[PDB]
């Protein structure tokens, strides 16, 4: 689809058996989701943006369905105010910015 | 252009006669730039990022060129780690996200 930017570009995602809303975020290197359980091993990470850094758990090789399109990649889990789909997964669903 | 997301979507902007690098960010509601001087009066705003809130100066009706496309709109100035072009100006240059 073509998504305009008059409002936040929020989509439904499926991750870990759960439906969530997330922001399609070209300004994010990483995909960061609010607290949830994910299977497998993880490692701690610090990620930053405006306002500084938060501590997250890094899970690798996680499958997500983003607006109907499946992708696999690293997912970070922690106290983000909004769930964000960053470039590591946007690339996999073929997302581009066009103007 | 069509901008893919394998790398950060960094473009050149021109503001106050100066060239700067900035991130085209569909996840950002607002445009925020690192400290610089802009003309006129400003108003206060607090904006929230992944790591918390920062105080910024809001300048309205600022002339800015984004990857060659002219816009005139609101620019926030403050302690952002990266210059960010948000949806308020992405919509003026006709940007969409497509997949
Ligand atoms: C810029 C502002 C107007 C405040 N908007 C936002 O910041 C909104 C806030 C929303 C609610 C909280 C959760 C994040 C979302 C999306 N963000 C936009 C969102 O696109 C935001 C923009 C950004 C980029 C770089 C530096 C700072 C900020 N990106 C991010 O926060 C991501 C998070 C991550 N993946 O690690 N940061 C980065 O990708 C990133 C890249 C370079 C950096 C350099 C130094 C310091 C930090 C750096 N962070
Ligand atoms: Na894993």
Curated annotation (Swiss-Prot), chains A, B:
Domain named Peptidase A2: which ranges?
20-89
On the tree of life, the source organism's domain of life is: Viruses
Give the span(s) annotated as Dimerization of protease: 1-5, 49-55, 88-99
Active site as annotated? 25
**Description of how the protein assembles with itself and partners:** Homodimer, whose active site consists of two apposed aspartic acid residues.
Q: Explain the purpose of this protein.
A: Aspartyl protease that mediates proteolytic cleavages of Gag and Gag-Pol polyproteins during or shortly after the release of the virion from the plasma membrane. Cleavages take place as an ordered, step-wise cascade to yield mature proteins. This process is called maturation. Displays maximal activity during the budding process just prior to particle release from the cell. Also cleaves Nef and Vif, probably concomitantly with viral structural proteins on maturation of virus particles. Hydrolyzes host EIF4GI and PABP1 in order to shut off the capped cellular mRNA translation.
Protein name (database record):
Protease
Organism this protein belongs to: Human immunodeficiency virus type 1 group M subtype B (isolate BH5) (HIV-1)
Source species taxonomy:
Viruses, Riboviria, Pararnavirae, Artverviricota, Revtraviricetes
Q: Which gene encodes it?
A: gag-pol
Q: Which part of the full protein is shown?
A: 501 to 599 of 1447
């Amino acid at each position: 689809p073509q998504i305009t930017l008059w409002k936040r570009p929020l989509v439904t995602i499926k991750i870990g058996g759960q439906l969530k809303e997330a922001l399609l975020d070209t300004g994010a290197d990483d995909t960061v989701i609010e607290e949830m359980s994910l299977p497998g091993r993880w490692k701690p990470k610090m990620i930053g943006g405006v306002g500084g850094f938060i501590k997250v758990r890094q899970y690798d090789q996680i499958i997500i369905e983003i607006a109907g399109h499946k992708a696999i990649g690293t997912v970070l889990v922690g106290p983000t105010p909004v769930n964000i789909i960053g470039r590591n997964l946007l690339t996999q669903i073929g997302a581009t910015l066009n103007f």
